[PDB]
Amino acid sequence: GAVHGHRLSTVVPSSVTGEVDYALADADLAFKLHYLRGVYYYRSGDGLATKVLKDPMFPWLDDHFPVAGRVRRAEAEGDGAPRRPYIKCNDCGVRIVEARCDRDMAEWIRDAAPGRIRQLCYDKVLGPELFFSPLLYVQITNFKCGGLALGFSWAHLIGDIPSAATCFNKWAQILSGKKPEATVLTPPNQPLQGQSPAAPRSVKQVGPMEDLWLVPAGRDMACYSFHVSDAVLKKLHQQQNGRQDAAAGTFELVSALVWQAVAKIRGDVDTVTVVRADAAARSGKSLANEMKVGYVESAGSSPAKTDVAELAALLAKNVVDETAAVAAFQGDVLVYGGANLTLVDMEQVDLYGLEIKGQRPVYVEYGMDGVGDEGAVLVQPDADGRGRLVTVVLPGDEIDSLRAALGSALH
Amino acid sequence: GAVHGHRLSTVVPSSVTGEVDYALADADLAFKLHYLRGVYYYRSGDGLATKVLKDPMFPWLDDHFPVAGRVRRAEAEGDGAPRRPYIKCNDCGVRIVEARCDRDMAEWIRDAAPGRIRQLCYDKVLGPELFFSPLLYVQITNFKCGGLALGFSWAHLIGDIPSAATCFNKWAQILSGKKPEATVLTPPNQPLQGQSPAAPRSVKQVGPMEDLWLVPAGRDMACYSFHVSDAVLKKLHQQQNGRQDAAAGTFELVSALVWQAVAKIRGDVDTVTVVRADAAARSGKSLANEMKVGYVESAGSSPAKTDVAELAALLAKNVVDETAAVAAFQGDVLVYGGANLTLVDMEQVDLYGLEIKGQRPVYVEYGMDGVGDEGAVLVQPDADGRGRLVTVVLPGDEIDSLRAALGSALH
Amino acid sequence: SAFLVVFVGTVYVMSRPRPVYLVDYACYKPPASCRVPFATFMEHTRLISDDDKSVRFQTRILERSGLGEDTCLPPANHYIPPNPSMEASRAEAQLVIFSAIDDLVRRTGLKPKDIDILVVNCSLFSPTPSLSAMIINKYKLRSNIRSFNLSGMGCSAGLISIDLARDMLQVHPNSNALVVSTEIITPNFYQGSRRDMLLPNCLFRMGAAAILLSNRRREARRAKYRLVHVVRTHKGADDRAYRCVYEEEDEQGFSGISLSKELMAIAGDALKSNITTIGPLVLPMSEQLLFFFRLVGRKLVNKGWRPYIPDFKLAFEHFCIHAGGRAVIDELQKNLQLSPRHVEASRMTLHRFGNTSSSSLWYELAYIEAKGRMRRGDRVWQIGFGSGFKCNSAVWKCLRSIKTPTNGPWDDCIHRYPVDVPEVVKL
Amino acid sequence: SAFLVVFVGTVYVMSRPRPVYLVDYACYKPPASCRVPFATFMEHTRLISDDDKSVRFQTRILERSGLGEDTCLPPANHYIPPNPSMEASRAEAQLVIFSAIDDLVRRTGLKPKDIDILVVNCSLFSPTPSLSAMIINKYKLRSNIRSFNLSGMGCSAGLISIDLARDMLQVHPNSNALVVSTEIITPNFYQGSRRDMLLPNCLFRMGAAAILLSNRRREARRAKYRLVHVVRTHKGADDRAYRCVYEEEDEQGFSGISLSKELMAIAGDALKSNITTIGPLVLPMSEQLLFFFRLVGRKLVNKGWRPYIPDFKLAFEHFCIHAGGRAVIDELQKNLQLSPRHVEASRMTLHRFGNTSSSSLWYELAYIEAKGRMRRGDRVWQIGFGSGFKCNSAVWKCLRSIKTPTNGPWDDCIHRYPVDVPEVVKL
Ligand SMILES: CC(C)(COP(=O)(O)OP(=O)(O)OC[C@H]1O[C@@H](n2cnc3c(N)ncnc32)[C@H](O)[C@@H]1OP(=O)(O)O)[C@@H](O)C(=O)NCCC(=O)NCCS
Numbered sequence A, B: 001g002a003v004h005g006h007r008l009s010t011v012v013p014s015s016v017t018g019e020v021d022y023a024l025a026d027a028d029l030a031f032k033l034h035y036l037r038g039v040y041y042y043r044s045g046d047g048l049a050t051k052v053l054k055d056p057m058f059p060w061l062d063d064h065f066p067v068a069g070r071v072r073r074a075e076a077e078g079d080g081a082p083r084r085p086y087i088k089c090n091d092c093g094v095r096i097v098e099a100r101c102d103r104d105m106a107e108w109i110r111d112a113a114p115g116r117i118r119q120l121c122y123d124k125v126l127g128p129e130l131f132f133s134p135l136l137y138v139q140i141t142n143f144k145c146g147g148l149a150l151g152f153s154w155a156h157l158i159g160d161i162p163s164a165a166t167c168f169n170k171w172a173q174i175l176s177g178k179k180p181e182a183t184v185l186t187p188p189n190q191p192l193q194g195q196s197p198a199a200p201r202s203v204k205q206v207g208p209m210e211d212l213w214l215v216p217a218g219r220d221m222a223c224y225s226f227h228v229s230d231a232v233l234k235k236l237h238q239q240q241n242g243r244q245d246a247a248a249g250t251f252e253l254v255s256a257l258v259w260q261a262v263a264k265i266r267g268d269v270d271t272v273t274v275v276r277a278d279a280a281a282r283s284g285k286s287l288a289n290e291m292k293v294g295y296v297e298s299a300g301s302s303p304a305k306t307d308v309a310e311l312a313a314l315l316a317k318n319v320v321d322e323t324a325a326v327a328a329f330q331g332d333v334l335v336y337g338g339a340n341l342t343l344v345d346m347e348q349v350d351l352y353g354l355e356i357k358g359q360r361p362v363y364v365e366y367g368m369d370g371v372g373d374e375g376a377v378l379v380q381p382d383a384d385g386r387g388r389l390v391t392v393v394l395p396g397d398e399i400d401s402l403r404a405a406l407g408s409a410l411h
Numbered sequence C, D: 001s002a003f004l005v006v007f008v009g010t011v012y013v014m015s016r017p018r019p020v021y022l023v024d025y026a027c028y029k030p031p032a033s034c035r036v037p038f039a040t041f042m043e044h045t046r047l048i049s050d051d052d053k054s055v056r057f058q059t060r061i062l063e064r065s066g067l068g069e070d071t072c073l074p075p076a077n078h079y080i081p082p083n084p085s086m087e088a089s090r091a092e093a094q095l096v097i098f099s100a101i102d103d104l105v106r107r108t109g110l111k112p113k114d115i116d117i118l119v120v121n122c123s124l125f126s127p128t129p130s131l132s133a134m135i136i137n138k139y140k141l142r143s144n145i146r147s148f149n150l151s152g153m154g155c156s157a158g159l160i161s162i163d164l165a166r167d168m169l170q171v172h173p174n175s176n177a178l179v180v181s182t183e184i185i186t187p188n189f190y191q192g193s194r195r196d197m198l199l200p201n202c203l204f205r206m207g208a209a210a211i212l213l214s215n216r217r218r219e220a221r222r223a224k225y226r227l228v229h230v231v232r233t234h235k236g237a238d239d240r241a242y243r244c245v246y247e248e249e250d251e252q253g254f255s256g257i258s259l260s261k262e263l264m265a266i267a268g269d270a271l272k273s274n275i276t277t278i279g280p281l282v283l284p285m286s287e288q289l290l291f292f293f294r295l296v297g298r299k300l301v302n303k304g305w306r307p308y309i310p311d312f313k314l315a316f317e318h319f320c321i322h323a324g325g326r327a328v329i330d331e332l333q334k335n336l337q338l339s340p341r342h343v344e345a346s347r348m349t350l351h352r353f354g355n356t357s358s359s360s361l362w363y364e365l366a367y368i369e370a371k372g373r374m375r376r377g378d379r380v381w382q383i384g385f386g387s388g389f390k391c392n393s394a395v396w397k398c399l400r401s402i403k404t405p406t407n408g409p410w411d412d413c414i415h416r417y418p419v420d421v422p423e424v425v426k427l
């Protein structure tokens, strides 16, 4: 009942780009150890053989030619204590895996075992051959009923979650016959005179590994997905009575609910970071990790016995943003679970904008690879936009206990 | 260590024989369940690649065209309860197996392990697809030292041991450049008009097998080779002193020695049959089973403590001939080890007559296959032509107990 | 003035084509050390295939196929299983080709440095360098030779090579053309079990032919035949007749030719589409006018009278039908109402040599020579059909009467032919 | 009288050879969805071969190969690993042929029933029915068409097909010949690890050409070139030259083309043996008489003076050297002393399209047409070398000046050419 027949391929830019050095920014290299794992389910894949899904990728990669590039390294000024990487824009391409599944797709949507995102999207990283590792992978599975599951394996080095979701929208628009927006990538990034010796409280400076940009697991991290309905956030709105409301009800109480769920299984969950996927902080939205990294301390109230609205007000209005300190730090960062449990707010993105012909996706979930040693949650909107969808990536020992410690509030 | 790389092939007669129904004698149908497994070793196989060994097989096979035939079954006149087989002389051919071994050949010749003929010639019989089973298998193995071992697997149906050995010598005479003698097969063998309803005492009739012309073993029969010298021949020749010498000590003393050796491992060996391969009774040797089958009872007394000279004088001149009733008997008679131990005397045959270029063989041992639950010994001349060589075929659990009983007398 | 007969003279002479002379030809006779009887082919078939369906089908086809016990296979189809490589097939191409050119050079006195045109054809096997560069390497032919390699053109590329050398023997004068036409059947062995792809396994045997053509006027006394007509009919425009004989790969990934079920009707309407473009050329005038008078009789009385086929027995003395199969020959004998003597070369070449190659026509010509029936002034017809359903034809005219000891491929067995070829073979 | 000029008139006219005009030709332009750069070729090599010895070789070859970034491989070598079947290679033959003839039919007004000669060549791929029968089935050509499939003759069969269509048009009057020169490189991919058999993996790219030749007098106002000379040189009699380019099988059983180590010492001496048999034809008398007046000067004075090389820059204006590799073009620039403008067509064809086929000369001709440098009465030299080391050459002469928009295979990139082609690709 697993996927098989992994036929690999490569789609390249349709035009020669010449010698180009897309120089990565400081925040580009601060997020290099993480990997977006995103799949997009569809109720029908008729008329969608893997030549009409691959032929729009040649004009799509013309506008996004650093995605088809490869990582190289330059030389330092004096002795080579740093070696700043850059995406060499040779037309080296991105992998197109064409798998197939024999199980029914709808019964795989109704699943509790955390093995969906690891199976349905191709699990490679910027691996041991760092100079020959693609920055994007597409897995196109076909089910027994006839569904379609476009699974994108995006590398967080080149661009973040808005710059990944809109980049996939810009391919679905070419597939739908539309004309996408012309993407800027024109102002070249420059190294800032930083070196940031005051280390952030959101990070954990790992050892400077050479050619494997994937901090190893240690634990047994797995990507479990659960959907939260629209009526549950109404129950998250009938608790903050008699006081002022500064919690953004679309994300903040949803994060505090799973924070309270983790604060019955794990004791030391005191410090917690967030990474704000804000659209207003997209100053020159080209392809860049424009996340807002900020940690939240709970100095007086422990989160294990405190109500979810109080944790919501603690996380929302009391944040210490350090998104420039993580950029100015000298690499090897691992912000997705370095010291604290991370909460990602990627709900503002047009996640269901992967219209192939006129087909809205029926389920869109994201997962992460290279998550740190405390875990991560990934809130994201559902198909109708009423409720939310949370894919939590726990160390794996706490998955089945979260099924009991969380199902009481959902039921 | 073991033989590998079995490359099967097929050589056919060089001229079309047309449709020829080569009828079989009753003595040919009596011996149809046994199989000659005889290998011929060589110190050097230079100039003997498997084309110059295969091209003389085509002018050899049209000389002996019923060897390349296949067994069929005619329809009876009245009720079809008997159906007489006949070798239909279509040029289906004989198998050529071209294997190799990375072992030193001289160490394998001096190996006391009973599995040597099982590996060096092709273990196939007239199998369950009886109408398409080859009647002869040559196995040509080449050694790392540079030797050669022609392994001839001969079906006893078509011809006996003189009629196999002289046929292989007739092949080697064409291979060397000589001219072989007139291979007569001109009088057609006819079914004799004798029924013989009483079974002979030298045999045990097995069940009426349909298409597998091989009795299933039950036990784990193997063939052990031990060289007996002419000094051991003269040693037993000084034991019939003070008596008249009528026991032909070229065969009789050795067969009495192995009978005395098996009469401390098995208790009831008092009646032992002897298949006499006489050269004076070869009335028109064409391709025929002109053996002499006779059972010998040991005068009531037990051979457990009887001397080998008394056993020689008891087994030589006191033979009750049954070779005219084992042929006239109808159906699956199992001569070689059916009800009595068999002592075959294949020593007068031209066994080292495989002159290939000028090359005498260094070692020739014959084994059998399909031997019943009583055993079989096989004397044959050794390389000097003075002593003997015995390949004894025991159940397998009697092999190593014979090594303790015969090693003192051989010394 | 006497300058009115020279303008119907030398102008007419310079408008006449050069004659193409078949000097001799040397058909390769395979040794008896490579023959495959019916019984050993059946025993090799039911030893590598476990199913009792694809052995019971080849057993019926090889029974009712008209092949005999003298048909030969290369020294790689004798193993169980066969091991065809590119070094065991090219070594089989250095055997059937070179020992057929050597049988031609010694019997005509041909010098290799006076070969100007070389046309080799082999359907499946086409290595790099080709089978023409192999002959140029072997016999050390000249650096300005016109070499060609017509590969992939089926079992009718013998007459395509004949027409190619003939149309090269009109542009270049005083030249000799070596035409080699083989079929290397070591990689032509299908391995799987598809029932439409197992017919080239049960029909294709060893065979080769080296042909020496020349347009020199000195060779008018040494040549045996003069080439008169070559008529080509490529029926590949139909979709059925193009994918009829068609090389595929099955589900296991084994290559092989696949013969369709309607191979017979596609053939018989490509033969008669070649007969109606050779009837105006080779028939007598009386038969043509009688056919026209019986053709205009179905125009005014009733739309379709009885079909009057012209008698080709009064237009040819020898018929060389390409020995494809037994069913293909006796339906062409059924059409043209041929005698059993007329199809006797094609039946006994199918019996002796099997369906060899595109060069079965030359073994048939050597049969009707070796029987001593080839008088001078006789007309030869060579009907050859293949893949893409090109159905080419050729008309030769005998120059000198051929002696009975021919030293060809039929010499050791011409006194045991013809044989009664039965409908079935007893097994 | 009045017959004093007729017999030196119309007798000479009936001895005059028929002219063969190149009407038009259409090269296949592969789409940019099938392009293979240097980087993805390297990343595809170091994912199916774990040994870093047959990868560090590919690095040096494709670095110093002169192939650019727009070279195209078929849609079966884009997979990791490639899955070259027969269906994926036959359906790739239906892409590069049927969209190169359709570019020729729509630009010439050619009818399918006005095709009388069809000469297709493709070295490695040769299916059954032939590649010519595929064209006859698709375009529905006539029943009596002269169809020839020259398979196995290597990368120099692009001019063997031209010479064959030349000689077939001398026999048949008022006919149109179609010449398709391809290389179906889906089965031409080496699957092993031997170093000598890995050079066709780096250089062989996609390409085709569909040529229309005719002998009609009406095709002299519309046609582009007239065929002057075709000179064939077959060095296959030598044993070093025969087995230089050889289709072997390696130890693991993977077929492929095995180039020898002395590839340039044979291709420089199979080509300078082709210069001497084209010198008397194409040079002026003022070069030839000076050449043998200096050649008699090294006969009686001493055993060889300083060798004067005949200027072919005074004999031709346009050179189309076959784009085999970079190391052949730079040494032919050394011997013949050509300018970089003369070898600009071959270098930019190797850079844009790569070592395509036997039809790289037609992409070079489209280069020197698309730049507008092809005037009236210009002489074109097309040197082509292959396997068996046939080294054929051809000389054309332009009949009408070609305009700059030519809608061929160069249109989108002719304003960015020529480019500086470096020695090593910096990676
Ligand atoms: C076999 C051949 C003798 C004709 O058939 P036949 O054996 O004379 O006669 P049959 O009536 O037995 O033929 C039909 C049988 O063979 C099978 N058969 C015959 N041709 C078949 C084909 N092309 N594909 C599949 N099955 C075929 C039929 O299925 C039937 O077997 P079945 O019981 O499974 O249905 C054979 O010569 C032939 O078909 N033509 C050969 C032509 C050729 O090879 N041309 C190449 C040109 S050089």
Ligand SMILES: CC(C)(COP(=O)(O)OP(=O)(O)OC[C@H]1O[C@@H](n2cnc3c(N)ncnc32)[C@H](O)[C@@H]1OP(=O)(O)O)[C@@H](O)C(=O)NCCC(=O)NCCS
Binding pocket: D057, D060, D061, D064, D065, D155, D195, D196, D197, D199, D203, D245, D259, D260, D261, D262, D263, D323, D324, D325, D326, D327, D328, D355, D385, D386, D387
């Ligand atoms: C490919 C080409 C650029 C040569 O590249 P290059 O830069 O000259 O490469 P070199 O041969 O000097 O590189 C050295 C290596 O080449 C290898 N090599 C080169 N040609 C080889 C051949 N034919 N077989 C085996 N090895 C070969 C050597 O094994 C050597 O190994 P190394 O790495 O240990 O030194 C080109 O000049 C060429 O080889 N010509 C072929 C033209 C052609 O293919 N013809 C087309 C129609 S046939």
